[PDB]
Amino acid sequence: ARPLPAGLTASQQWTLLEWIHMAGHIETENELKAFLDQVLSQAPSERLLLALGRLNNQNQIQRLERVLNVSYPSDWLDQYMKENYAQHDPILRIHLGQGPVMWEERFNRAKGAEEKRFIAEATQNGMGSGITFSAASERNNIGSILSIAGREPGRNAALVAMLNCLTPHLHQAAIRVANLPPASPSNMPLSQREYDIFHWMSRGKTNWEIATILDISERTVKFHVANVIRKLNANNRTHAIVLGMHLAMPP
């Protein structure tokens, strides 16, 4: 996870609390759009971008999923697509979840020719330097990037730390609006062996009416049942009949 920043006034702190809180409440796209609007107006810039993207193991982006963009100049867009800078952009090469990255700092250390060429072209349309924050969701190799272009965003150390802890909640909010399909565990086994044993564990039976029933005897029933109760994260078995109440219905 990410550790909160400090050396934030309460306003700064209260504010951030505000953002995270609301973010937990975003569903429809309209919500997400406005929310960012209020964010990018306590922000030394008017050019933002929010994108989902599938991830690899080192948490690089390979393909982009969806973009819920904000302000980027629609000329730099046209050109970004046409020239297919997507490949030569040194920013899509970050490893996600490592927040946050300065455009300037990551532009003086790119040493390819296709890169140094993109970098220069960016520096004309204002994308010379900027900062981007990232969040990743390794359960599913999906990730978020959030960019703001400009030299001024990064000179605001307080606000950088705030946006950086907000990111991972924007990520959650993003996944929610774009209703991506699973992604499935898909679902935790009964499990097979457990269902026969849990199938009946819940109502009207003892370790013995079960072992005999499964031809495993009270003993096998006993060895197998507590794998269940610890599987279902339950201290008590009749507490395991309560938590694992749902499986014997959803299959």
Ligand X SMILES: O=C(CCCOc1ccc(Cl)cc1)N[C@H]1CCOC1=O
Binding mask 116-135 for a second copy (x = CB under 8 A): --------------------
- Out of 70, 122, 131, 210, the only residue in the binding site for ligand X (CB under 6 A) is 122
Single residue of 102, 213, 214, 243 touching a second copy by CB under 8 A: 243
| Sites for ligand X among residues 98-117 (CB under 6 A) | 103
Residue 166: exposure state from Cβ atoms within 10 A (0-12, 13-18, ≥19): buried
64 binds a second copy (CB under 8 A): yes
Q: Which residues are bridge partners to 69 per DSSP? A: 49
Binders of ligand X in range 8-67 (CB under 6 A): 49, 64, 67
Q: Between 128 and 167, how does the x/- string for binding to a second copy read (CB under 8 A)?
A: ---------x-x-------------------------x--
**Cβ pair 145, 134 in contact under 8 A:** yes
Burial 25-56 (b: 16+ CB within 10 A, else e): ebeeeebbeebbeebbeebebebbbbbbbebe
**147 phi, psi to nearest 5 deg:** -115, 145
Any contact of residue 89 with ligand X (CB under 6 A)? yes
Q: In the numeric block, which tokens belong to residue 181? A: 């399909």
236 contributes a contact to a second copy by CB under 8 A: yes
Torsion sign across C-alpha atoms 179, 180, 181, 182: negative
Answer for which of 4, 81, 120, 226 binds ligand X (CB under 6 A) is 81
- Cβ atoms of 47 and 26 within 8 Å: the answer is no
Residue 133 near ligand X by CB under 6 A: no
Q: Do you find a cis peptide bond into 183, omega within 30 degrees of 0? A: yes
Our CB check for ligand X shows the closer of 211 and 232 to be: 232
Please enumerate in sequence order all residues whose Cβ is within 8 A of that of 16, keeping only pairs 6 or more positions apart, or say none: 8, 162, 165, 166
- CB 158 within 8 Å of CB 8: yes
Region from 73-81, 90-98, 105-113, 116-124 binding a second copy, contact rule CB under 8 A: 73-81
To ligand X, the closest distance from the beta carbon of 67 in angstroms equals 6
Q: Dihedral through CA 160, CA 161, CA 164, CA 165, nearest 10? A: -150
Interface with a second copy (CB under 8 A): 1-2, 4, 10, 13-14, 16-18, 20-25, 27-30, 33, 64-72, 74, 77-78, 81, 137, 139, 165, 168-169, 172, 178-180, 182, 184, 186-187, 233-236, 238-239, 241-243, 245-246, 250
Give me the residues that bind ligand X (CB under 6 A), please. Answer: 49, 64, 67, 72, 77, 80-81, 86, 89, 91-92, 103, 122, 127, 130, 147, 242
